[PDB]
């Protein structure tokens, strides 16, 4: 029914991507979306569906689509499989076990990695608690190391929570950069709002 096209490219070929802990989340509504653009594209290296059809997805309609966007290293590209542990899903981006959506990733050494090092991409390295599903951590406090109190990161046992990614181009693929788009769909007892092309 709905007639206006959903812009994915504002996320997918976005000139600049987010950093991990402050992952970019662009909600989609009142439009239509041809997901064929992705599951035929060769540009993507890793691409997973979770509980959703790759194809009859675009037969389907939703209440809205959430497309998430950020950039991680290589050996943690898999850390956004559901119910997983490691510095990423524990701390700065977590999908729940009961996940329904799509994960897409591809090399960005071509773009996001320059000589010297694109240390401007950071992840979260410390946090007292675990991360909730879709919880966004942009807290910068002292990470109290469990022995002594602290105000300001003065000295030891108080760590600046974050850490840069050294992206040198010569660095290997596990320590290369990887843009990541975490698609996601939801429904509700509320009108259909985002459709696919073949959605009658």
């Amino acid at each position, epitope marked *: 029914n709905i007639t206006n096209l959903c812009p994915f490219g504002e996320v997918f070929n976005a000139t600049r991507f987010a950093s991990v802990y402050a992952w970019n989340r662009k909600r989609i509504s009142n439009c239509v979306a041809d997901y064929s653009v992705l599951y035929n594209s060769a540009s993507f290296s890793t691409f997973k569906c979770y509980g959703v059809s790759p194809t009859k997805l675009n037969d389907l309609c939703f209440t809205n689509v959430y497309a998430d966007s950020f950039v991680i290293r290589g050996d943690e590209v898999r850390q956004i499989a559901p119910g997983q542990t490691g510095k990423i899903a524990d701390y700065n981006y977590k999908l729940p076990d009961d996940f329904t959506g799509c994960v897409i990733a591809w090399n960005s050494n071509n773009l996001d990695s320059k000589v010297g090092g694109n240390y401007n991409y950071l992840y979260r390295l410390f946090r007292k608690s675990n991360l909730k599903p879709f919880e966004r951590d942009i807290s910068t406090e002292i990470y109290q*190391a469990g*022995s002594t109190p602290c105000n300001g990161v003065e*000295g030891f046992n108080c760590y600046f929570p974050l850490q840069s990614y050294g992206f040198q181009p010569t660095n290997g693929v596990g320590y290369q950069p990887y843009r990541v788009v975490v698609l996601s769909f939801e429904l509700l007892h509320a009108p259909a709002t985002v459709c696919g092309p073949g959605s009658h």
Partner: antibody
Amino acid sequence: EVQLVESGGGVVQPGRSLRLSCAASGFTFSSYGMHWVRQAPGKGLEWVAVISYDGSNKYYADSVKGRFTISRDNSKNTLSLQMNSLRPEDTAVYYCAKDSPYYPGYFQDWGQGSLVTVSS
Amino acid sequence: DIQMTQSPSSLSASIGDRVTITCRASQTISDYLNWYQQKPGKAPNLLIYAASTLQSGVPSRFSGSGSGTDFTLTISSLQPEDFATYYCQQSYITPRTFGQGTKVEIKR
């Protein structure tokens, strides 16, 4: 070539004092801060104390909080641990240690060692 | 203050063995752990950081794992050039105390 030699290793009667002098070379002494680590003769390694990148912050071990003190000279590129009311427990060889980056410790660069023997 | 309990106490293994040393933690110290191989009489020589990455120049038969209070030291094939006392240390907290230390033997 990160060279770290040290001296002051010798003799002292308990309750009397001495200090060790770790001389740096082949690396930016300012790059990051140092630790002293103490090895009893043929025993485990015992961490002693740390001093910072900018000579401002120091942690010590609870054995040495009260009678030991750590310091460094960023100009002549040397570290020094002064040890005041020594106990025979303190008999050991000592090592100065670089805090190699580790993005958080991991001492890769050690001094040869120098022995404090506390016999009168 | 945290102590590292590293076991076994000693080890009289032989050539080619795949023997393993372990390290228990007083708290959750997630990866900031280090192993050092002390060729005796000399100063400790580094082995591992993150408990799971080499340092170049160190031979590959070594490794470890663990993400918590319990970690491993994997040595696949022993040569007489592994004869040392192997130590444990947590980089996570300061003081960076150590383990008791574990010695290794050889000889079929």
